[PDB]
Design a binder for this molecule. Structure first.
Ligand SMILES: *[C@@H]1O[C@H](CO)[C@@H](O)[C@H](O)[C@H]1NC(C)=O
Ligand SMILES: *[C@@H]1O[C@H](CO)[C@@H](O)[C@H](O)[C@H]1NC(C)=O
Length: 2011
């Protein structure tokens, strides 16, 4: 035998079959690639974002002064990222602003001019210049000497002597004023007293009032200070200042608002490397925008514009020109509520007033500036006056500057001084001379300072308004907020309007709207992003929204109201640094789309494999191969390798595209191949399992892809609960292989993120930190699911005188049976011989099927043995199957396999090599007469030659024994002979056994016969022996002609046979016939011989046409051995009878069917229920929670601290109330604070332990201060990692730790670099905190750093007004009323600009509320660090709450969109669920359109209108029940908008009209589908493609308020899609929810809205469109159905001329003139002209040559198809105009069975009785009679459809015979009836004809058509070739008189010679041993010339089927 040869063979056939398909083959290799191209377009549409490190500057809170606060607002607007650590994140520094040119200028100034060891002596000059021009230069009132007065006084006095003088005066002074040394002394009675003082030209002795003199103590320093000043101007700092300020003054310089900001930035900020980078965000889905990516613009409407009361005419023009200008319009929107907003402080009481008094320092300090600027309006004119008309300016430097000694002093002056210009630019008034450098420096300062003055008064700086309850606050809040003038509103909940003293725990709320606050639902991003979260606009709403500034101000006030410390500390916020990173947005969609695409790419290749496996099992092609000797395992193992080699060829291309398409960049392309392979191997063994469920191929092909897809959906639910999925639930759910695929895909993507592939090294491990489910478990569980599926499918497949005769010794008995019994076969003993055909009879299986089974070898015997060549089968079960051939009743052929391939396959399977197999095939193709069309497909053969091939296969190889049962069943009489030729040819050397039931076939061929009576041989022998063993006489037939009234005179007919009358005579006389019956017995050759002889010449005299003399039928010899006009309803009553017959017909079918009760009821309810249940997992959003802000709302976490600046006081207690008992924050109060977060117990400081490798690394190696512990590898060029690699080189050693009794873990970072420790240990934290990528917590959120100081301004307060007042007094100003108050606050104004001793807090922006949670901790420790030393600071605290401000009807205009978008999906679920019932109603119509049941209804007369009307009527009422169940489920869920006393009518009407309008829509789909399953799965997809893409597009398309073409599309689709009801139901179920939302936001605040449905605005036009299209479609289905609905032979002449020219019907029933049926056109009509006529009492035959075209005659006669101008009439009317009047006078028995397989036998009769007549009380008796006539009473109540094989045919012949029609059409009314059953039908069909009712018959056999027909007509390609009776036609178109005789040691020499009398014939036909067949002539002379023989004899007439072969022979 073989085991590896069968496999080669089966592989060959399967490979050859999977080549003639060529459209499954192409799809199975192209569809996956067309599915993975989109996944490459998505790779290229989602690029990659990387960035370097980020170090961020810090932000000062108001408590850190005002100058740092405002400078930090302006400098850090964009929050820059700096790549290199900022100067403010150092241990002792906080400032962060060197390198501003305005600080370097100051440093240079203070360095070289000030602190001048050289001079430092301008103090002397100032003291002298002030002591003179304050005391002496005035002299206005004080008294003096002779030479003393205010302005001009002389000295001359005290002279008693009377008075060259001009010469003396000129010598005294040289052009000198009152404001020389010796010349007059040597020229000298005047030198006695008149020279009282020698005070000569020496310049310093005049002011000797009290004490003082100094002359050249001015120039010695005035020439000192020059070169240093010049050098200072030559420093680079002043160079840069002057350079930068060159624009910004020249001509429209500041216009670009990037030059201006650039100048200001380089001047005030100092930031390096360009400024910074501005990291971005890219999320939009944590914020629910849905219009950030969609392109819509998202702005609130700009607020109301109203002129205000008491602001200004400038502060109303600006607010408008700056707001309605669509270029700024947004910055202003954000900045306005801060600088003109307003703050509201509900609990108006003394204590809150004190808090808000102390919380007000910032605005006070900020109006101290407006006063100082208003003072210029007063001091301006005074400076003007002093510099224009003064006694000290133009009277000391313009009226002077001596000018002669002054000129001499100027001669030694500097280079560029210009005393002339120093006089022109020092008092020129009435000049208008011009530069001018004098007044263009003063009018400019006015123009630029009064402008600032009139800008600064727009700011509102009094903004605390009180109230008394929260409701009034909220009312004023929305009133202001619609104007854009609202800051927060503060609420002190636990105090009363009479409270006076503060409790030692104060809490408050900040209530702001939601656009400037973080949402209080979420506290994290749901999906982790790998980015710093440092975007200035979306990620910092607690800063530009002003929440943090107000929080700081109020906490400072609360502290200051109960501590009285008078030593402040400010707060700086610092953001923690972040490492390098890459952000890939593909890895989000890869992780979700890879498994979907992979599962969806095999969805077709799975179904087309279950299809093949089940189909070849449905054609019984598997039990054939199992009988032939093939084990089941080989079958499966070949199926596996068939399916495997196409998966394995598509995988090879998937790998290439995935790798080289850059979907995966670096991942070892061999492991991915070997990973997809396991999925394919599990999939195939799933197909093996799925096949063992189904029994019909078409159903499996549809239900299998659906199961494959459904099995994957658990991964959706396992992609949410990633948290509570342990290791075991991964090891257990992963038995479903498609989820084990996704569980490995996630590790694939997680590895690809890290910069690593899989690389054969990490697949066994996991990056998920000890989750013990590696990547290998996925592979190793798919390769286990395969084994489980295979080994479950295998088992589940398994579970499902004498009578015998003398036998010549010259015969070799090949097969011999020796008493085999089984329990059936009682003492059976027969021998089948060598070359001989044996016809093995027996009724059905009483001894035939059982015995043939053993002879074949299937089953063993019970008692006896069998020999095949002398060797029992039970002993040689295998090698005996070498000779046994066999063929079963059905065909054994493979579709798509050519004929020669069949011969080769079945030759080689028996055991042969290709050589001999090919040789034998070539011999067989020549012996079989199929050498032509040898390479044709096994289908598409004629159908008789399919049987010819199926019986030629049983002979293949060397078959010594052939068993074949009914080889010729069901082929036309011309193909039976073609088959018989084969058997008569291969008969030569092998035995053949031939079970059959055709009785003539057992005789025309067959050499022995055996009859199995009741389990035993009851006869045997040759046919002649059997005829003689029973021996009844001859059958003389006599046929009379006509001249109607033909003939019929038995008087002269019986008289002729009365002379030799034997025994029984006339046995029949049917119309124009005269059958007889006579014995043979006692030879009497002369007697008989003389009869025929004499009759021959005396024939034409009597009137007969001819005569025959047949023997005894073989069927009659086997038959006796086995076990032997009511009136009709019509009219409206008839129609009211039809409409009640059909309803009962459908009702009785639905009760008994349960596969209806599924798709009619169960599925709708379950699917809508699931939709609803997954619709309410979302609650009806309230307003917003409170969310007390404290740092434990995050999980376990690490905090830190850092005592910078130690030893100092107030910091060693601030560092202790923060670590020790009171702890961080506020959780541990002695009393309360949220008894949900408990307090525990602390542990001592404990440094962790370190690997020795590290400790060796640090002390041995030499590090630095700028380069501590080693760096981290960043993304290079092709190894882009998500986060850097970071070796065992973190910040350094682990620092001390602890566990605060809060349960946090703080670590002490004192004396260490923090921005090195934090950037390098972050990845090692979030690698252990990742592993899910949802709701990660990061374990580190903040820490404090106590210390930092910025150097404050050095000059004190009063020391500045002391100087300013003196400067004023020296120049006559004296200020006024405003100035004397602007100088009041100047000593307190300078202590509030900076703080000098202040802390900083570090925050991690990846947790949303973590800024204001640690700001509170800081402000909470500052309180406890300063309260008096006997109050136990464990009790004090402050807590902040948030609570946003109620939404405003436009905020909700988007929560509505986000809320109704789930109801827009429940609507699609409802449509998809309800579109199952109408698709179930259509499968029934398809089932009746095929199998011709509908046509059968129509023939009886059901007038298609009433058929369709009754179907629609039943379908509506059947659908109403499911609709009512859906209404019940909505009422149960009690939802609003659908089940409310005004939404029930809308919902119910909307549900009912849907079915009403959609049922008639899908009726036309019943005319173009012929397989129910394909129709179901092609309607369930249209009712989805039209359900989604019509209900959703309008919804999505309404959210575009612009483009003016999107609305153009929307408003016209909403009118163009109203043609079909899926739209009319989607736009109804969505609108009934939108209206509810809109009428439910109103009821939130007062507004009333009571809109109703049924109003044509929402659901009126829908309910109209449904009613109209529920009728137009129905009329369409009433029309799509209305479109559907020479010479001749010498015996055809009589029928030609009977009714054409004579006209002779006058009583006939089927006048049927020349009818012709021409197709559109091929050559000629299939039916040509034909004339026939049927009399009342005879059965027409109408045989017809097969294929020539006969069925078309019945099609025309039954109205099935259309005639081409014929003429056919029935008894009273015609066939062309009154067809409904001729379809009640005829039955019709279809060739194929047309019965509903769910009712029963009896109610088919009930139905068809009702469909025609039979009033109500007679149906009972009519149906009773019909059941017993045909013999059905045993089975008459057992669901036709279980009826075996002939009860169906009996039923069809019963219902065709109901009532009493005068015409009956029978089409092959006996097909699978055993030979006893046929008689019980033929008797009936003769009983009718005896009554005068005609019958037209048709059959493939020539037996029945000979048994009960009275005339025939053979049809050939034309019309006719004969008419007349049987006997009349045998002779007129045949020959015959076969003669047989046994030669009584026999020899056959003398017989041939003695046939000397009979030469014209004698073809001899046979001779085995002594039997002699012969065809003599037809003169019946043999009967007289046989009485001198030489034993037995016989002379029969040729059979009727010999005539048919003769007619069909020529064609
Ligand atoms: C501005 O200053 C100039 C001095 O250059 C003076 O003449 C003039 O009156 C001032 N006012 C105006 C409006 O120019
Ligand atoms: C801290 O409290 C007590 C101290 O008496 C200690 O025994 C206990 O184990 C610690 N933890 C808790 C939760 O009490």
């Amino acid at each position: 035998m073989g085991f590896v040869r069968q496999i080669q063979l089966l592989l060959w056939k399967n490979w050859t079959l999977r080549k003639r398909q060529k459209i499954r083959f192409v799809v199975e290799l192209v569809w996956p690639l067309s599915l993975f191209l989109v996944l490459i377009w998505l790779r290229n549409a989602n690029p990659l974002y990387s960035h370097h490190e980020c170090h961020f500057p810090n932000k000062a809170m108001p408590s850190a002064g005002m100058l740092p606060w405002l400078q930090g607002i302006f400098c850090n607007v964009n929050n820059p990222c700096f790549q290199s650590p900022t100067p403010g994140e150092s241990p002792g520094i906080v400032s962060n602003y060197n390198n501003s040119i305005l600080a370097r200028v100051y440093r240079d100034f203070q360095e070289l001019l000030m602190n001048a060891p050289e001079s430092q002596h301008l103090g002397r000059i100032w003291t002298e210049l002030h002591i003179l021009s304050q005391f002496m230069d005035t002299l206005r009132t004080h008294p003096e000497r002779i030479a003393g007065r205010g302005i001009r006084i002389r000295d001359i006095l005290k002279d008693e002597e009377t008075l060259l003088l001009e010469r003396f005066i000129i010598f005294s002074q040289r052009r000198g004023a009152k404001t020389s040394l010796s010349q007059g002394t040597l020229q000298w009675l005047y030198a006695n007293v008149d020279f009282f003082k020698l005070f000569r030209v020496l310049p310093t002795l005049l002011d000797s009032r009290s004490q003082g003199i100094n002359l050249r103590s001015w120039g010695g320093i005035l020439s000192d200070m020059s070169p240093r000043i010049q050098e200072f101007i030559h420093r680079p700092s002043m160079q840069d200042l002057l350079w930068v300020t060159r624009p910004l003054m020249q001509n429209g310089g500041p216009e670009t608002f990037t030059k201006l900001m650039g100048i200001l930035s380089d001047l005030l900020c100092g930031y390096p490397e360009g400024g910074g980078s501005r990291v971005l965000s890219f999320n939009w889905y944590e914020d629910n925008n849905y219009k950030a990516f969609l392109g819509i613009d998202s702005t609130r409407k700009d607020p109301i514009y109203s002129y205000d009361r008491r602001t200004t005419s400038f502060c109303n023009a600006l607010i408008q020109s700056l707001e309605s200008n669509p270029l700024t319009k947004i910055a202003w929107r954000a900045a306005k509520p801060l600088l003109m907003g307003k703050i509201l402080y509900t609990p108006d009481s003394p204590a809150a007033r004190r808090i808000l008094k102390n919380a007000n320092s910032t605005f006070e300090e900020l109006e101290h500036v407006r006063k100082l600027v208003k003072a210029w309006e007063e001091v301006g004119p005074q400076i003007w006056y002093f510099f224009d008309n003064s006694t000290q300016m133009n009277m000391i430097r313009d009226t002077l500057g001596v000018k002669d000694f002054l000129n001499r002093q100027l001669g030694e002056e500097g280079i560029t001084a210009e005393a002339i210009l120093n006089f022109l630019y020092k008092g020129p008034r009435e000049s208008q001379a011009d530069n001018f450098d004098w007044r263009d420096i003063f009018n400019i300062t006015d123009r630029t300072l009064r402008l600032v003055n009139q800008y600064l008064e727009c700011l509102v700086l009094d903004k605390f308004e009180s109230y008394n309850d929260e409701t009034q606050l909220t009312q004023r809040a929305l009133s202001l907020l619609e104007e854009n003038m609202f800051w927060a509103g503060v609420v002190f909940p636990d105090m009363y309007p009479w409270t006076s003293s503060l409790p030692p725990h104060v809490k408050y709320k900040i209530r702001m709207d939601i656009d400037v606050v973080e949402k209080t639902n979420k506290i994290k991003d749901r999906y982790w992003d790998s980015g710093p979260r440092a975007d200035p606009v979306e990620d910092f709403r607690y800063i530009w929204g002003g929440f943090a500034y107000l929080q700081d101000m109020v906490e400072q006030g609360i502290t200051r109201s109960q501590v009285q410390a008078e030593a402040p500390v400010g707060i700086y916020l610092q953001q923690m640094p972040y490492p390098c990173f890459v952000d890939d947005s593909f890895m989000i969609i890869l992780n979700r789309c890879f498994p979907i695409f992979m599962v969806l790419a095999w969805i077709y290749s799975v179904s087309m494999t279950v299809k093949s496996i089940v189909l070849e099992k449905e054609l019984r092609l598997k039990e054939t191969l199992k009988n032939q000797g093939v084990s089941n395992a080989v079958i499966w193992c070949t199926w596996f390798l068939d399916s495997f080699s196409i998966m394995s060829m598509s995988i090879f291309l998937l790998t290439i595209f995935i790798m080289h398409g850059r979907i995966l960049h670096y991942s070892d392309p061999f492991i991915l191949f070997l990973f997809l392979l396991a999925f394919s191997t599990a999939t195939i063994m799933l197909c093996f399992l799925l096949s063992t469920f189904f029994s019909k191929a078409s159903l499996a092909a549809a239900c299998s892809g659906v199961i494959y897809f459904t099995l994957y959906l658990p991964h959706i639910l396992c992609f949410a609960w990633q948290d509570r999925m342990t290791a075991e639930l991964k090891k257990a759910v992963s038995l479903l292989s498609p989820v084990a695929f996704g569980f490995g895909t996630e590790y694939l993507v997680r590895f690809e993120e890290q910069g690593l592939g899989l690389q054969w090294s990490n697949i066994g491990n996991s990056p998920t930190e000890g989750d013990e489910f590696s990547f290998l478990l996925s592979m190793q569980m798919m390769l286990l699911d395969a084994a489980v599926y295979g080994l479950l499918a295998w088992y589940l497949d398994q579970v499902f005188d004498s009578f015998f005769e003398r036998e010549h010794p010259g015969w070799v008995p090949g097969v011999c049976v020796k008493n085999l019994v089984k329990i059936a076969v009682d003492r059976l003993n027969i021998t089948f011989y060598e070359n001989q055909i044996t016809a093995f009879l027996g009724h059905n299986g009483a001894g035939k099927t059982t015995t043939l089974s053993i002879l074949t070898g299937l089953l063993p015997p019970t008692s006896g043995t069998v020999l095949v060549g002398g060797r029992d089968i039970e002993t040689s079960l295998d090698a005996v199957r070498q000779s046994l051939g066999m063929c079963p009743q059905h065909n054994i052929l493979f579709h798509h396999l050519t004929v020669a391939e069949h011969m080769l396959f079945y030759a080689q399977l028996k055991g042969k090599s290709q050589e001999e197999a090919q040789l034998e095939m070539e011999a067989m193709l020549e012996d079989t007469g199929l050498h032509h069309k040898r390479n044709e497909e096994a289908q598409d053969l004629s159908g008789g030659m399919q049987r010819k091939l199926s019986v030629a296969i049983a002979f293949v190889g060397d078959a010594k024994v052939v068993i074949l049962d009914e080889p010729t069943s069901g082929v036309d009489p011309y193909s039976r002979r073609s088959i018989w030729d084969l058997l008569l040819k291969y008969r030569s050397g092998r035995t053949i056994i031939m079970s059959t039931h055709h009785m003539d076939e057992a005789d025309l061929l067959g050499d022995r016969i055996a009859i199995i009576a009741q389990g035993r041989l009851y006869c045997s022998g040759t046919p002649l022996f059997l005829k003689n063993c029973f021996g009844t006489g001859l059958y003389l037939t006599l046929v009379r002609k006509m001249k109607q009234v033909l003939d019929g005179d038995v008087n002269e007919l019986m008289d002729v046979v009365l002379h030799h009358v034997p025994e029984a005579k006339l046995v029949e006389c049917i119309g124009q016939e005269l059958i007889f019956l006579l014995p043979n017995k006692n030879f009497k050759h002369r007697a008989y011989a003389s009869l025929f002889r004499e009759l021959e010449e005396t024939l034409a005299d009597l009137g007969l046409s001819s005569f025959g003399i047949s023997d005894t039928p073989l069927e009659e010899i086997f038959l006796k051995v086995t076990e032997d006009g009511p009136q009709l309803n019509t009219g409206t009553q008839l129609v009211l009878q039809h409409v009640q017959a059909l309803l009962v017909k459908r009702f009785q079918h639905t009760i008994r069917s349960h596969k209806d009760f599924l798709a009619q009821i169960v599925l709708p309810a379950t699917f809508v229920f699931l939709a609803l249940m997954l619709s309410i997992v979302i609650p009806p959003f309230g307003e917003y929670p409170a969310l007390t802000l404290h740092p434990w709302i995050y999980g376990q976490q690490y905090t830190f601290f850092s005592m910078d600046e130690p030893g100092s006081e107030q910091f060693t207690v601030l560092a202790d109330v923060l670590l020790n008992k009171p702890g961080f924050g506020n959780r541990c109060l002695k009393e309360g604070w949220l008894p949900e977060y408990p307090c525990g117990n602390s542990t001592p400081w404990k440094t962790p332990s370190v690997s020795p490798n590290i400790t060796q690394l640090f002390q041995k190696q030499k590090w630095t201060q700028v380069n501590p512990s080693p760096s981290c590898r960043c993304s290079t060029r092709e190894k882009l990692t998500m986060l850097p690699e970071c070796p065992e080189g973190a910040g350094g050693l682990p620092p001390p730790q602890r566990t605060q009794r809060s349960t946090e873990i703080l670590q002490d970072l004192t004396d260490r670099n923090i921005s090195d420790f934090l950037v390098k240990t972050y990845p090692a934290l979030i690698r252990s905190s990742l592993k899910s990528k949802f709701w990660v917590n990061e374990q580190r959120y903040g820490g404090i750093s106590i210390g930092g100081k910025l150097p404050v301004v050095p000059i004190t307060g009063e020391a500045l007004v002391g100087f300013l007042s003196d400067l004023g007094r020296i120049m006559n100003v004296s200020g006024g009323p405003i100035t004397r108050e602007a100088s009041k606050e100047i000593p307190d104004f300078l202590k509030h600009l900076e703080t000098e001793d202040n802390i900083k807090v570090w925050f991690n922006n990846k947790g949303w509320h973590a800024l204001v949670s640690f700001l509170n901790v800081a402000h909470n420790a500052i309180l406890r660090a300063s309260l008096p030393k006997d109050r136990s600071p464990e009790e004090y605290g402050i807590t902040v709450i948030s609570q946003p401000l109620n939404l405003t009807k436009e905020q909700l205009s988007e929560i509505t969109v986000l809320t109704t978008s789930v109801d827009a999906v429940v609507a699609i679920c409802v449509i998809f669920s309800m579109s199952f019932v109408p698709a179930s109603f259509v499968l029934y119509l398809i089932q009746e359109r095929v199998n011709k049941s509908k046509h059968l209804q129509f023939i009886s007369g059901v007038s298609p209108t009433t058929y369709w009307v009754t179907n629609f009527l039943w379908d509506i009422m059947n659908y109403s029940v499911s609709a009512g169940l859906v209404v019940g489920i909505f009422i149960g869920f009690q939802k609003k908008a659908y089940t409310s006393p005004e939404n029930l009518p809308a919902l119910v009407a909307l549900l009912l009209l849907y079915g009403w309008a959609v049922i008639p829509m899908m009726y036309p789909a019943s005319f173009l589908f012929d397989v129910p399953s394909t129709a179901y799965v092609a309607l369930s997809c249209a009712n989805l493609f039209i359900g989604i893409n019509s209900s959703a597009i309008t919804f999505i398309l309404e959210l575009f308020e612009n483009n003016r073409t999107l609305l153009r599309f929307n408003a016209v689709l909403r009118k163009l899609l109203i043609v079909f009801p899926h739209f009319c139901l989607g736009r109804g179920l969505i609108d009934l929810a939108l209206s509810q939302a809109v009428t439910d936001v109103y009821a939130r605040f007062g507004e009333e809205h009571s809109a109703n449905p049924f109003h044509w605005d929402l659901i009126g036009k829908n309910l109209f469109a449904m009613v109209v299209e529920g009728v137009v479609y129905f009329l369409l289905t009433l029309l799509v159905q209305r479109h559907f609905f020479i010479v001749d032979e010498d015996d055809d002449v009589a029928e030609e001329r009977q009714r054409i020219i004579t006209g002779g019907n006058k009583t006939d029933i089927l006048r049927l003139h020349e009818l012709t049926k021409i197709y559109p056109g091929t050559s000629s009509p299939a039916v040509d002209r034909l004339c026939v006529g049927v009399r009342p009492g005879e059965c027409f035959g109408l045989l017809g040559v097969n294929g020539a075209g006969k069925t078309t005659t019945f099609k025309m006669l039954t109205g099935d198809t259309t005639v081409t101008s014929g003429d056919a009439t029935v008894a009273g009317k015609s066939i062309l105009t009154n067809i409904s009047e001729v379809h009640q006078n005829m039955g019709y028995c279809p060739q194929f069975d047309a019965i509903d397989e769910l009712l029963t036998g009896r109610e088919h009769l009930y139905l068809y009785a009702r469909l025609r007549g039979v009033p109500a009380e007679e149906i009972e008796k009519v149906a009773n009679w019909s059941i017993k006539s045909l013999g059905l009473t045993v089975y008459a109540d057992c669901l036709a459809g279980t009826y075996s094989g002939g009860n169906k045919r009996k039923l069809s012949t019963a219902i065709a015979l109901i009532g009493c029609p005068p015409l009956v059409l029978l089409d092959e009314p006996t097909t699978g009836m055993d030979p006893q059953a046929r008689r019980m039908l033929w008797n009936v069909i003769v009983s009718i004809i005896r009554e005068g009712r005609a019958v037209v018959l048709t059959s493939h056999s020539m037996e029945e058509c000979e048994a009960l027909c009275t005339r025939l007509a053979i049809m050939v390609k034309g019309a006719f070739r004969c008419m007349g009776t049987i006997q009349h036609l045998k002779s007129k178109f045949g020959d015959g008189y076969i003669v047989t005789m046994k030669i009584k040691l026999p020899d056959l020499n003398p017989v041939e010679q003695f046939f000397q009398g009979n030469f014209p014939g004698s073809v001899q036909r046979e001779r085995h041993y002594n039997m002699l067949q012969f065809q003599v002539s037809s003169s019946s002379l043999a009967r007289i010339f046989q009485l001198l023989l030489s034993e037995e004899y016989s002379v029969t007439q040729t059979t009727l089927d010999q005539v048919f072969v003769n007619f069909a022979k020529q064609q």
